[PDB]
Amino acid sequence: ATDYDTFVSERFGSIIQAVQTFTDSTKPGYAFIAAKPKSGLYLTTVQREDIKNYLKDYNLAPITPSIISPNYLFIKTNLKVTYALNKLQESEQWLEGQIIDKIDRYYTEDVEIFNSSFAKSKMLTYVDDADHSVIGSSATIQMVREVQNFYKTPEAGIKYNNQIKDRSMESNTFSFNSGRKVVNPDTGLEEDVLYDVRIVSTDRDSKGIGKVIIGPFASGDVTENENIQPYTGNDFNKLANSDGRDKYYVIGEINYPADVIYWNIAKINLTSEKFEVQTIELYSDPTDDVIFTRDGSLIVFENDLRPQYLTIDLEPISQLEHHH
Amino acid sequence: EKFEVQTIELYSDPTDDVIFTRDGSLIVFENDLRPQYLTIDLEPISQLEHHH
Amino acid sequence: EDIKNYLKDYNLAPITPSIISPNYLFIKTNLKVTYALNKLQESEQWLEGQIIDKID
């Protein structure tokens, strides 16, 4: 870690706020250094080529350390703060600002650091701490791993470094392109029907394993031969429809206890071409309210840039027959 | 007569992230004399990096 | 288990080195020492001790 990270952390301390090295058991030979810009999220490919070009500075001929951006774990927070009407001078809009700062001040200080961790109980005491009028808060978290490629998990897998619950793992939705014509003079003569779809996990087996299955289809546009046939279990979360779509299929699988997640859309004869996205986001409920980082993973609150991962509900109180 | 007891306990869980006491009501914590109203389950954690 | 638990101390997540006891090769020795009566003060039992130390 610090053996080489620190140096770098000297010649570049004006940008990078977090640097640590690690190996991949598997990508033998390769040493990577994750670095987080103090100034946001991803170092720029120019900022990255400069930093790599101090590798020559310190003479090493062997292929030498790949710099790269950190594997972020995000907390989708659903915050609720109840406050006293009397004791609150400015706008609700102000108050939010006042606390959404506190959250960040906790993250920067105690969390946004390698192998340091997020404790929901701590940041809530930060929230409480934001005004002299913030009587008490509560909070509900999710974990977000932002997936680089939707089509197949890495060679190795995707892991949260944390225990999730059953059926918990679920990506967002991405358009699948069937291939049929719609024949609609509204928009010409042909739209190419494309219905949303997601990738969810099902319940632990006898032995700790689930199945990573992929959202609703219309019989025809997925070819089934004995082997590859519709999944049947109802041990997962189906999604809102308006269409006659209820045929989910099975790729990869979740090892709940070892938290590893592998899937590969290929397991059903569907080329990347068929989906109009390239990136997705995987969510899942933690088991605990204390969540952890490990090799090159970093937990981070970047809220003016990932605002989708915080929501604040306030509850103004006076006196009082009622706060819900 | 058909009931062994005299006193019982009435549990509800609030919608309140804040519980209000009020008239003659009083929120108290007497663990010694009311230990039943507190269970602590600890959990120990492995150390992280010790190496540098 | 103590010694293995410095493996965490120095951070490595991969399954990391198994400590274990050495594969011993032993020499069954059948020793014979001939000594001079005159020049030996203490017991034979002593002498043995004296040499069984030297071996070690």
Side-chain angles (χ1 to χ4, degrees):
Chain A
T2 68
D3 139 311
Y4 176 114
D5 323 344
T6 61
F7 287 93
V8 160
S9 198
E10 298 189 299
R11 294 213 164 194
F12 291 87
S14 48
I15 34 183
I16 91 196
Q17 75 150 305
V19 243
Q20 138 172 134
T21 320
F22 68 91
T23 111
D24 206 326
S25 357
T26 153
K27 282 154 145 183
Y30 302 98
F32 322 76
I33 53 260
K36 169 188 198 311
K38 75 127 190 288
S39 21
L41 270 159
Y42 316 112
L43 279 180
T44 180
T45 157
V46 46
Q47 276 172 326
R48 294 182 183 174
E49 290 188 327
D50 304 337
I51 175 57
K52 198 172 216 145
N53 289 151
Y54 293 93
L55 294 174
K56 291 179 179 179
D57 218 24
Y58 197 84
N59 43 9
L60 197 52
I63 54 278
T64 81
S66 348
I67 72 69
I68 73 58
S69 291
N71 190 44
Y72 294 105
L73 213 228
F74 289 103
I75 314 292
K76 233 260 250 279
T77 309
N78 241 77
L79 181 70
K80 285 152 186 76
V81 186
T82 103
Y83 70 108
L85 266 170
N86 351 138
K87 314 311 163 89
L88 200 253
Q89 308 290 30
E90 279 84 355
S91 185
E92 263 190 12
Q93 170 76 345
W94 176 78
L95 211 260
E96 284 187 350
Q98 209 60 26
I99 71 192
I100 170 155
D101 277 342
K102 280 298 190 161
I103 290 181
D104 190 66
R105 212 269 211 160
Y106 162 63
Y107 264 86
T108 38
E109 278 189 298
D110 302 7
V111 180
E112 306 203 3
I113 286 178
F114 284 86
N115 311 306
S116 216
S117 47
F118 177 86
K120 173 217 285 192
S121 29
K122 229 153 190 183
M123 87 141 176
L124 286 172
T125 110
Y126 267 77
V127 180
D128 280 9
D129 192 13
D131 197 77
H132 274 96
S133 144
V134 177
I135 265 165
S137 63
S138 65
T140 261
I141 69 187
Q142 254 188 313
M143 284 186 309
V144 203
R145 218 88 224 213
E146 282 172 332
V147 179
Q148 299 260 49
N149 176 61
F150 75 102
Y151 194 84
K152 47 160 284 80
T153 38
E155 33 309 329
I158 149 66
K159 56 163 43 213
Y160 281 109
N161 302 320
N162 269 280
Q163 216 59 45
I164 77 180
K165 309 185 181 197
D166 254 15
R167 300 137 147 265
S168 172
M169 191 218 60
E170 63 169 30
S171 77
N172 71 76
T173 45
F174 43 79
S175 326
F176 162 70
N177 192 3
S178 55
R180 322 141 162 159
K181 101 282 179 182
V182 71
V183 173
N184 58 351
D186 302 50
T187 174
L189 303 135
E190 281 202 358
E191 274 294 329
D192 221 331
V193 160
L194 21 58
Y195 51 72
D196 276 14
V197 145
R198 61 183 195 155
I199 69 211
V200 196
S201 93
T202 73
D203 287 316
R204 299 161 195 253
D205 77 354
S206 16
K207 100 188 219 318
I209 296 282
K211 294 276 195 172
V212 173
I213 91 170
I214 183 174
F217 292 98
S219 191
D221 42 35
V222 199
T223 66
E224 307 139 25
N225 4 263
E226 156 247 2
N227 63 336
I228 275 184
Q229 256 82 69
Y231 177 87
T232 167
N234 271 217
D235 55 340
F236 59 84
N237 305 293
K238 308 205 173 188
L239 55 28
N241 249 26
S242 303
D243 300 297
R245 302 190 280 113
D246 83 342
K247 323 209 174 191
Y248 302 66
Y249 293 67
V250 193
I251 49 194
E253 61 185 18
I254 329 80
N255 191 121
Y256 280 90
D259 80 320
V260 261
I261 316 190
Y262 181 97
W263 78 72
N264 186 318
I265 304 305
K267 293 179 180 176
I268 60 179
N269 304 324
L270 284 185
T271 22
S272 264
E273 291 71 281
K274 295 271 196 169
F275 311 84
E276 317 209 326
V277 294
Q278 222 282 332
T279 188
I280 71 176
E281 301 140 355
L282 211 50
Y283 306 92
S284 46
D285 290 66
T287 288
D288 310 331
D289 282 356
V290 181
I291 89 145
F292 304 97
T293 48
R294 216 185 184 168
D295 273 336
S297 306
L298 190 72
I299 282 157
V300 68
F301 181 73
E302 276 281 350
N303 191 103
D304 40 14
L305 180 176
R306 182 61 59 180
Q308 21 168 172
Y309 295 156
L310 212 214
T311 92
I312 302 194
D313 312 331
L314 289 74
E315 195 176 355
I317 279 15
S318 224
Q319 295 103 28
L320 155 300
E321 186 222 82
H322 223 295
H323 97 128
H324 198 35
Chain B
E1 267 62 29
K2 285 212 192 75
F3 306 94
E4 52 174 16
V5 285
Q6 262 280 232
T7 176
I8 68 167
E9 344 280 321
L10 197 49
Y11 301 102
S12 59
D13 38 71
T15 343
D16 310 31
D17 291 328
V18 164
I19 321 289
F20 313 99
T21 141
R22 163 150 335 157
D23 272 332
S25 276
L26 188 49
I27 298 183
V28 72
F29 177 76
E30 290 288 319
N31 190 73
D32 48 19
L33 214 167
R34 209 60 64 158
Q36 24 170 185
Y37 295 156
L38 202 177
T39 92
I40 303 162
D41 294 286
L42 309 91
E43 176 178 5
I45 258 332
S46 4
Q47 147 131 235
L48 183 301
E49 251 223 41
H50 214 15
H51 210 230
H52 273 126
Chain C
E1 290 188 327
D2 304 337
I3 175 57
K4 198 172 216 145
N5 289 151
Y6 293 93
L7 294 174
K8 291 179 179 179
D9 218 24
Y10 196 84
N11 43 9
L12 197 52
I15 54 278
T16 81
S18 348
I19 72 69
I20 73 58
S21 291
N23 190 44
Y24 294 105
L25 213 228
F26 289 103
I27 314 292
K28 233 260 250 279
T29 309
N30 241 77
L31 181 70
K32 285 152 186 76
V33 186
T34 103
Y35 70 108
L37 266 170
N38 351 138
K39 314 311 163 89
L40 199 253
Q41 308 290 30
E42 279 84 355
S43 185
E44 263 190 12
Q45 170 76 344
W46 176 78
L47 211 260
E48 284 187 350
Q50 209 60 26
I51 71 192
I52 170 155
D53 277 342
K54 280 298 190 161
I55 290 181
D56 190 66

